[PDB]
Symmetry: D2
Subunit: 425 residues, 4 copies
């Protein structure tokens, strides 16, 4: 229908030049797709109650950040328990349950050259409490990342390390840090003090571009909606900043004081949710996909080959979603790197993977709880149907839609290799 092609900036998406795309942007063209940029909310006195945390999950919070620069281990263990209680209060309805990752943001090296002794104790605390992500403060070289990985020990092998770039050395040694990290955080607060304030935007755009090229998650952080710490509505520069972080290519956007100590934590999450949906519909996929395809190297990895074929197929039919079965989240990450307009519904049995895939833009994790079927092909079909039923319940899919299904040839991680065009019934 004509109405379908007037929504989600589709006239602007069909434009032949970026200039014509801008000219065709319409304030009356409503966003239809689900919000794909994840929201990281910092936990503190304003967002610690179980009842307030339930409201933040409903507003769109995907990752809860624990800032280990403040508070004791007892304080952070209580934060973890309240987050998990609020998250599990919706587990009674598996088709609508939303996993929420828990990220530990370290205190940092301070005046020291490498990993501090408090960071070693805090990292061990994180492993013992089952955190999913580490936001490693003041990463200056590859050996800083290796020190964090060593401090996590053998039990913390599955924890993602997102390196925070906060100074000139981190910006200069970016390539070596990105190579050994799982992703990056553009920590603009310290970065704006370490380098001239008027240069932070160049560092943010460079790091986002390089992370997008590498297919690794990138978080834009600090002062995005600062004025909402005390005021009910943000400034015109703040809404523009959030929108531009999404247009730059950020996988995640973050709230610090807005959710930890401010007076509008739920509204700050709602505002980031609303801006991100508008900005995602304004993305010029025509040039973006072409450039991501052209820049990505040739590959002999079947997961990598299936991912590009599935994204290409999704664009060809305007697929409502790409449903992917994943154990570690990697198959969903490789689909996410090509920035499909189709939502990536990732069905997994790993609760940790379901929490961690929020780091990748456009990945909507579904945690499958059923015990395995005796026949593997039937267990695979049951999970795909769970993805279709959750998608229908949440508004991602309707009868008549086309979906791309990405599965593998045997159980276990690393064997994705099948792309299937499916009609929703």
């Amino acid at each position: 229908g004509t109405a379908f092609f007037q929504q989600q900036q589709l006239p602007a998406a069909m434009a032949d030049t970026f200039l014509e795309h801008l000219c065709l942007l319409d304030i009356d063209s409503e966003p239809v797709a689900a919000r794909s940029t994840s929201i990281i909310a910092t936990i503190g006195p304003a967002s610690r109650s179980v009842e307030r945390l339930k409201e933040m999950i409903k507003a769109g919070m995907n990752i809860a950040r624990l800032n280990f620069s403040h508070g004791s281990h007892e304080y952070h263990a209580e934060s973890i328990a309240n987050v998990r209680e609020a998250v599990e209060s919706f587990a009674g309805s598996p088709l609508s349950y939303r996993p929420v990752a828990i990220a530990l943001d370290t205190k940092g090296p301070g005046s020291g050259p490498g990993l501090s002794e408090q960071d070693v104790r805090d990292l061990r605390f994180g492993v013992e409490h089952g955190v999913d992500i580490v936001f490693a403060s003041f990463v200056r070289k590859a050996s800083d990342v290796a020190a964090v990985r060593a401090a996590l020990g053998p039990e913390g092998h599955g924890i993602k390390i997102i390196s925070k770039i906060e100074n000139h050395e981190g910006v200069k040694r970016f390539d070596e840090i990105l190579e050994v990290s799982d992703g990056i955080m553009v920590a603009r607060g310290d970065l704006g003090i370490e380098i001239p304030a008027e240069k932070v935007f160049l560092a943010q755009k460079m790091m986002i571009g390089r992370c997008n090229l590498a297919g690794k998650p990138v978080v834009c952080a600090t002062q995005m909606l600062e004025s909402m710490i005390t005021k009910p509505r943000p400034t015109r520069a703040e809404t523009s900043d959030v929108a531009n972080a999404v247009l730059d290519g950020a996988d995640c956007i973050m709230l610090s004081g807005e959710t930890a100590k401010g007076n509008f934590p739920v509204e700050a999450v709602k505002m980031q949710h609303a801006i991100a949906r508008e900005a995602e519909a304004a993305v010029y996929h025509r040039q973006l996909f072409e450039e991501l395809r052209r820049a990505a190297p040739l590959s002999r990895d079947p997961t990598e080959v299936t991912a590009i074929g599935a994204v290409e197929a999704a664009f060809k039919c305007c697929a409502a979603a790409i449903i992917v079965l994943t154990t570690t989240g990697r198959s969903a990450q490789l689909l996410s790197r090509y920035r499909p307009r189709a939502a990536v519904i990732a069905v997994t049995r790993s609760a940790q993977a379901a929490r961690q895939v929020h780091l990748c833009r456009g990945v909507f994790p579904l945690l499958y709880r059923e015990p395995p079927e005796a026949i593997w092909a039937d267990d695979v079909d049951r999970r795909v149907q769970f993805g279709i039923e959750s998608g229908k319940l949440r508004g991602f899919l309707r009868v008549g839609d086309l979906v791309i299904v990405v599965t593998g040839w045997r159980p276990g991680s690393g064997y994705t290799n099948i792309m299937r065009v499916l009609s929703i019934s």
Copy 2:
């Protein structure tokens, strides 16, 4: 992984270029073609190419389609030509490495205002003798194609009608003719007499472009290697002409007098084979695929969606082949329209489809005659393995290579919706 030697062959340095101008500058006479020749050769059968022994030599040289010119000779003469082609083709049935299906095409005498009485009798002869293709002479409007289609009686609706554009009216009414035809022949002999000779190249390039856009086969015909009727080597203009027809986008190239009455019929086939291989490696796939992708409309047909995803996947891993299961040839045709560098190995139970897919560039048919398995998924696996073992036998594949496999979710034609990445073992 593949080596520097691999990336120096088949014009791969020229294929990686960022502009068409840089692609031209990087073409190398020392870069040898590795892929199998994908542009089919149509050879006209006449006194110089009628004997079973001569036909066996032409099959070995590369003839894929045998053309019977009904402008000369009786029905008895053409029935003997058909029998000799079939005898020469079946003389290699014992060896899997040498067996190659050969299509039989009937070229009509022509019109008078519409379908002539002799054309009705000749078309009826074609149906009775099981011809695969009709090259319909002097098509000027859509109603001429409908007359040929109606003349293919009740038993011949499976025969492909390739409309010959030979005059100004056919060129002007091209869109309506292509819409109702299976493909087109740029019949340059009469076209060069009906329109100014210096305008034939414009008509050829326009029709080839429109056929490529429509995803329908296009044949370049007449005087391609004319001097080879009496001389053992062609002129510099003739080799250039064959190469440029392949670079323009022609699915097939044809020999008329060169093979029907000339002194070097086998040598003419060998020459077309050698030039086509060189020209196919020089194709600028980078821009070609992007433009075929951008110009092809969005589709909700799973075969069309699977085909683009499979071609995209083949380019990503430099796949040795795309193995497709097809009953009518349609799934292989939709892969062929995106001009993959990988060979399209079409496994079919239909002898007619195996002969007719020679009309589509890069489709290498395999006729499969094993009795069907009781379990459909096992029958599918057996045909995919048949394609891999014939591929290994003929030099298309080695252990360690990657292939793309295109199949459907249920038996019967029209259900292609699956693309798999397979490692050859």
Copy 3:
């Protein structure tokens, strides 16, 4: 690499490391982003104009001199507050501070004066206070009118009529502040000289999360039309009370320049804030960094592909001159202009080279600050007897001011744009000159 090798050997590797030149030579926008470098210093003069609102914090002649030195190009008088006597005193103080630098003509900086109207309020069209304020503007010689709440083409025609016969030279920049203005944008732009994205009211009239779409759409359409566009309101809001802006504020300024804005504005930050000079300095610093990060390779290609064919010699000469400037990395394009139009047509193609506009019109010299990358030089000398000699003297005045301000160095290439006969509308010549 071969397309820059001889020029890299000539100008040096250090030249090609500054002003984001490695990022500018990238083949894709993605590679351009990856190559942005915080250590690549901006070299070019700041091309995006700064509009500063005059108020109690920025009214004194001494404070205004500091703001001119910090980079203020246009002084905005907000007629929503203050009396005619108050605004006349503000105008006089701006003119006094501007003329305090007139002793040195090769370095003098013109400053435009803009009148921002109160608006229609609850009314349907032009209010009676707006008619009195517009007459005040004509009587006091203002250069620009920022017309509040423009909702249709007839609103800008009413403003033009209220300016009368004597205000024909005044530029009307229409402020888009509501849903109707956004929806009727094309008809408003057609009859206006330019647009202001008035984000304050716009963010109240439409959902706050949609303002960025309206800003980007209007900037794109103004760039396509070749007409000036101003980005306004809350750009450095926190600097009203703090000496340093937030990370969202610096990002906002940078993104307005990257979107394609000709001008950026300061409101309460300069009118009533505690750091008016610091706010101007911050906008200056961010705009220079953002201008160097513009992806000229795709931008120029798209401006050419989108611009229709033209049989106007000024339009034809402008694209030829911008193309020539990119070919040699020209330090500047010196253009002779009477009304500012020839400089505006060069500016629409977004050259990296500075557009040094030599004019005898003091009003045109002030008004060309609306066009990005135009550096006005007011020529005060009496005419030569031979017209060709008068033209040459004006070109040499541009080269000498260019050398004395740092725009040009001996060995640089410059593009000179002139006409074949005196008077406006005859630009048709482009010359390549080597600086000696």
Copy 4:
């Protein structure tokens, strides 16, 4: 009506595929033929009357094949060409200069042969404009030809013929020291496999286009026309494709030297080239030539790109350039403008040699001088406009781009002007 002619619907297309789909056999070519025709002089094209007919059919360069005939035979051929060319000098606004090219015999079994030294000396003594140097294998072969031309032959253009594997492999070093290249497909098709010649032709044409140096496509282009009045479908396609590849010149060998239809062969190449030039996809071609050409601080180079860009912006009928050596016209030609490059020169040799560059129409200025330099310059621009109007290039109301310099003498072009006709 203007936008339906010269394949303008196909020229406006956003992709090459859409450009192909929009090619129209009913869209007539309007612009003058840009690709020069080199015709080989022999028994079938030696008479003054036959040569006059070939000049009217479109011959721009006369090739003397020194592989056959004596010096006396070639001197008579030169004299007949000059007599036929000067028979049209009575009308200066329509006079067509014709270059004379000497094609050497070659090294044979040997570097530079002793017969080649004598033939090159003959060429200098007889005032030839171009040398087509046979079997060039390395840069030192070009230097040997340059030395054999001596001090009296400094102005002669050396076009290196690439005829073997070594010439193809050492192409870059040969092009660097040559004025241009000839893709000599006859010997090349014997030295390398016949099925690889098209790759060598396309590579050399692309590299010459990138370098901004002339490239000639040669041998068997219309071969069958040696005995038949019409060419084959492969032959017309070959000529069209050489123009579409980017060749500056196309050549006729036996077709004009010994064939039964020399005038018809020239007419056929003229007709095909005009059709192929209108089918050129300028949208991508200009963008790629522009992107591939390096940045430059040479004012002639900078003015040339500004002028071609300006010509495309207004659909200029022509770019009128004042040139001494032909260089300013060559730098305009390298960007492949759709506008004709009308080169007004006083140098008769430069007027003949600029036929090597596609789209350059030389006008030999033989009008009285003006005392004031600026008036003399203006008069040459008016000469270009009047010849353009007379020959059909221009009409009243058209826009032209005029390219001149700031002071006399070669190497000072730095001005581009937009001018309205009449």
